[PDB]
Swiss-Prot record, chain B:
Name of the protein: Ephrin type-A receptor 2
Complex formation: Homodimer. Interacts with SLA. Interacts (phosphorylated form) with VAV2, VAV3 and PI3-kinase p85 subunit (PIK3R1, PIK3R2 or PIK3R3); critical for the EFNA1-induced activation of RAC1 which stimulates cell migration. Interacts with INPPL1; regulates activated EPHA2 endocytosis and degradation. Interacts (inactivated form) with PTK2/FAK1 and interacts (EFNA1 ligand-activated form) with PTPN11; regulates integrin-mediated adhesion. Interacts with ARHGEF16, DOCK4 and ELMO2; mediates ligand-independent activation of RAC1 which stimulates cell migration.
Sequence ranges assigned to domain Eph LBD in this UniProt record: 2-174
Residue span of region Mediates interaction with CLDN4: 2-174
Induction (free text): Up-regulated by UV irradiation via a TP53-independent, MAPK-dependent mechanism.
PTM info: Autophosphorylates. Phosphorylated on tyrosine upon binding and activation by EFNA1. These phosphorylated residues are critical for recruitment of VAV2 and VAV3 and PI3-kinase p85 subunit which transduce downstream signaling to activate RAC1 GTPase and cell migration. Ubiquitinated by CHIP/STUB1. Ubiquitination is regulated by the HSP90 chaperone and regulates the receptor stability and activity through proteasomal degradation. ANKS1A prevents ubiquitination and degradation.
Amino acid sequence: XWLAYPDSVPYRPK
Amino acid sequence: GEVVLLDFAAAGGELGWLTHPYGKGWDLMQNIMNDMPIYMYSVCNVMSGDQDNWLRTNWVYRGEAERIFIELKFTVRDCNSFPGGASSCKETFNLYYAESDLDYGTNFQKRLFTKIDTIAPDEITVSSDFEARHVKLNVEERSVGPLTRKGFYLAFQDIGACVALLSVRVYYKKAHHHHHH
């Protein structure tokens, strides 16, 4: 794999 | 003189847009390298065969709007960045919409949607810029109308690109559209 955007990580409000 | 109906970036990651299929495709992501977090919906399933990944906004109440303007900000990575395996990478994505009087909630049926356009970047981001954290942000706008139902959805279809969607701003325009201060 590859990321679309630098230094991005999956996010979900909690 | 703009009336804003939807503004993704202003919503700080809280809108919970629908993604289809379950799991594989568009994903809500955060970047925290600047003073404030940045949110986006990203997908980058290059080198993975045929892709058909959908992202759908929540229902948007039309109100008085008859002709809407849809402003997108996004990045696209150069397909030359990825191993020889654009034989398995695209540099566009597709914008769709559907009108409806009622909100169908979690029931997303792509067959109800009409393509507005293929969205292509003016500037692709090459690997050296990506690694230097200097991505190339693109802005594209399209207009749709006349609208006639109580509301509408927008949707974004990825067919195998490496794309980050950072802004989706939908507005209608009254006279005297300018800024101030």
